[PDB]
Design a protein around this ligand. Structure first.
Ligand SMILES: CC(=O)c1cnc2ccc(-c3cc(Cl)c(O)c(Cl)c3)nc2c1N[C@H]1CC[C@@H](CN(C)C)CC1
Ligand SMILES: CC(=O)c1cnc2ccc(-c3cc(Cl)c(O)c(Cl)c3)nc2c1N[C@H]1CC[C@@H](CN(C)C)CC1
Lengths: 282, 286
């Protein structure tokens, strides 16, 4: 894992210029930068060493991402810990978050096949976390702002600060009851992501009618009452084949079951999403 | 990727002591060793730097394995090319090859669930090669001697010397390759299908002494399945131990893998899912 000096980061970001700011992470700001003679675009997250939690999440990202390698995970290029700084350097994800292409945005709507391919890419990343490392890795914070899109629209999981070997609307309700650490909690959060891709609304909207506040509760309720199609993204109305719609909906439904033991594995989710894409074509 | 000096390897192997030789062949010789104050046990392949292809395969393994990280791939700990040597250091795979637990061995036969879990693990490694690296990696030499087993019987794919970005190997060769078609990851699927049939039948992929229709397992086993007699060529240890639903799922998957035309073959993700489903179909009925 590559070590940057503070001067290299300052150079890459043009001295943390305001016009390079891309947004804010948990404990600081994110900048567009370039390294290695301007040959490599990067994103650079500047954190907060005076936060106990910020330090813990910094070290957790480095411990995780310095040993993982997968097409559908955002790559950690390096870090900087000089000058009482905690800075992380990532590959540049030119199209930002999944979420900003779904709603509350001026970005155009995504075609259905592209949405399905994004969900498949994210599922491949999560499947790798659950089956491809030494031990199961539980992300703990899967959500549409933690799935980023590169210039080819390839989806990649980010934000490993809370990983182990939360966010309102994605929290596994069974955790507060059984208090067990399980990769099925990631499955639950990913089910919410699936419904977000389909319905193009936030996982949690506290202004709504009680029954609608949580997408994880509302979407299954609608599907079983035969009216999921009534809360689908208006852009997608009429664009999903019946067999694809059924397979996608059933998969997302199973992800958000009350009881982690009844939820599918991510490998099962991934296979069913690939099957759904085939059924969109046939 | 870690760089070893010749002194480190000489020390790790007790100067290539012959009581540490794990294997010997055209690849070179493989030794058991220990590194880092004796905290990490390793296998050390000392190859021949005068062979042109030996150097090519050395460089290719280093290319590939330095960038990949997966539980079901043998880890490359490091290499050494000092002193005109050509040495690779691997995590130790205490139970050796999958082939030496199937046949022509004094080793006990593998329980059926254990063979399925081994096939699933190898499938996970191949699936990673096909979908997890920056570009598709085609292993090109999947076979039962290139699936190694660690102390916990975890299966891991080895030997990337022939791999490309996209231990007899005759019985595993994709026939569509002899028709000069463009090579794809479906050639790995084909070879893996042969592995599945070996796991089931516990005989070589290619036996040149047999009746002509039995020589190639990739031809013989589908033939027997379609004639309703696959269960007659199953490993005798497995007779009566596979549930009907598991047997059918496993055999159908293997048969799709060895179809003549790659475009008709399943992806490795499809194979993997169907093997996990086969295992569940074994466990639910018992
Ligand atoms: C906008 C853009 O082009 C871009 C390009 N490449 C990136 C590469 C990595 C990360 C990244 C950001 C944060 Cl806050 C992280 O914690 C991690 Cl682990 C990675 N972000 C970007 C990135 N933008 C960030 C900026 C906003 C941030 C979340 N907001 C709260 C909504 C996430 C997305
Ligand atoms: C026996 C034992 O305990 C052991 C333990 N750990 C290992 C770890 C790695 C490798 C390995 C060997 C070769 Cl020749 C390779 O090319 C590669 Cl990539 C890895 N081999 C072993 C290994 N044995 C080797 C020695 C025989 C060799 C020849 N095959 C039958 C054909 C393959 C297996």
């Amino acid at each position: 894992c590559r070590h940057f000096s503070f001067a290299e980061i300052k150079a890459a970001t043009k001295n943390f210029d305001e016009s390079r700011v891309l947004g804010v992470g948990g404990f600081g700001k994110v900048y567009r930068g370039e390294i290695d003679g301007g040959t490599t675009k990067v994103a650079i997250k500047r954190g907060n060493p005076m936060s106990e939690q910020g330090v813990h999440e910094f070290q957790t990202e480095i411990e995780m991402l310095s040993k993982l390698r997968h097409r559908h995970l955002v790559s950690l290029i390096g870090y900087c810990e000089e000058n009482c700084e905690m800075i992380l350097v990532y590959d540049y994800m030119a199209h930002g978050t999944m979420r900003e292409h779904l709603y509350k945005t001026q970005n155009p709507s995504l075609p259905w096949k592209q949405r399905l391919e994004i969900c498949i890419g994210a599922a491949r990343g999560l499947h790798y976390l659950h089956t491809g490392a030494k031990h199961t890795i539980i992300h703990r914070d899967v959500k549409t702002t933690n799935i980023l899109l590169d210039e080819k629209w390839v989806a990649k999981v980010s934000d490993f600060g809370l990983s182990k070997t939360g966010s309102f609307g994605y929290l596994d309700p069974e955790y507060f009851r059984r208090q067990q650490l399980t990769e099925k909690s990631d499955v639950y959060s990913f089910g919410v992501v699936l419904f977000e891709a389909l319905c193009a609304r936030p996982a949690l909207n506290p202004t709504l009618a009680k029954e609608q506040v949580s997408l994880a509760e509302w979407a299954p309720y609608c599907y079983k009452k035969g009216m999921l199609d009534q809360i689908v993204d208006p852009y997608l109305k009429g664009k999903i084949t019946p067999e694809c719609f059924k397979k996608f909906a059933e998969t997302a439904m199973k992800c958000v079951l009350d009881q982690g033991i009844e939820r599918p594995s991510m490998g099962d989710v991934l296979w069913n999403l690939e099957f759904a894409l085939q059924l969109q074509e046939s």
